[PDB]
Ligand SMILES: CN(Cc1ccccc1C(=O)NCC1CCCCC1)Cc1ccc2c(c1C(=O)O)OC[C@H](CCC(=O)O)O2
Ligand SMILES: CN(Cc1ccccc1C(=O)NCC1CCCCC1)Cc1ccc2c(c1C(=O)O)OC[C@H](CCC(=O)O)O2
Ligand SMILES: [Cl-]
């Protein structure tokens with residue numbers, strides 16, 4: 456489970472926020488894009504996999520699962536591309552709660568930037584640093600380091 | 605040591621590649637931007653600090669050191685903004701070699717993408733995964749996890 460990530464797409468201000476969640480820690484990366492295309496999703500995965508040891512990605516929907524550009528990125532970066540079916544129903548609820556948390560944080564910072572992308576990066580920062588006691592950023596590093604050792 | 609990063613700006617194809625290097629590990633993050641403005645640099649640092657525990661950033665030049673937008677980002681993200689004077693002359697050589705290495709890798713992948721930004725992310729991936737034995741990606745996680753414990 457140190458290498459497992461889940462994609463998630465949510466909407467705000469007529470734009471799309473694409474999120475990757477490290478399942479075991481709740482650590483996230485996110486970006487704002489005009490729309491959720493295979494190309495945008497592929498590029499996002501390429502970025503993610505250069506930064507963290509991404510073994511498996513559960514895609515956010517069937518279009519990204521099917522996309523040959525997404526499959527090409529997963530091939531390039533050595534990621535196992537998987538579906539995102541919530542065989543465990545709790546997964547569904549966890550993602551929904553996370554999207555609600557993220558949107559709340561974005562609201563709390565929204566007036567500190569003109570552009571949504573800036574607010575989204577502030578929200579990523581707040582989410583990853585929040586102690587719940589360890590933060591998600593601490594959890595992901597500890598999980599991965601333990602795996603290496 | 606675990607929290608120290610260095611900014612670096614290099615040019616290719618009439619574009620700018622902005623790089624942050626984690627000093628102790630040699631791990632890097634990078635992006636392609638049209639030109640190196642305070643605003644671009646500020647946004648890059650905001651992204652970086654939401655993803656890694658960035659304590660100190662040695663800026664790449666005097667304009668980014670001076671920039672009130674860069675200072676605002678460092679304030680926001682809790683980063684100590686420092687100059688990049690190579691008091692240790694070896695620093696200057698290390699960055700030079702790294703830019704040369706990165707450009708080499710970009711050349712090796714350049715025909716695998718239309719856009720430079722894609723090639724740059726491929727280069728980041730190859731750089732971070734390269735076993736030198738451990739990779740820079742392994743070293744950064746180990747260094748940070750050891751600090752946490
Ligand atoms: C210029 N504004 C001024 C501003 C405008 C309105 C409200 C507050 C502030 C303000 O000063 N906030 C305080 C600080 C500023 C530092 C980051 C932390 C918060 C902030 C900004 C900086 C870099 C960006 C931005 C933006 C933006 O407004 O969203 O948008 C994307 C941009 C992308 C890179 C590119 O395209 O150059 O990078
Ligand atoms: C569409 N091309 C086709 C192509 C064109 C020329 C040569 C090879 C290939 C090719 O198929 N290479 C295989 C690679 C393997 C790794 C990544 C997946 C594809 C690749 C591509 C995908 C997403 C992008 C790109 C690009 C680009 O060409 O640079 O550019 C930035 C774009 C930004 C996000 C946005 O704007 O949507 O995301
Ligand atoms: Cl963090």
Ligand SMILES: [Cl-]
Pocket residue numbers: 504505506507508732733741742
């Ligand atoms: Cl890595």
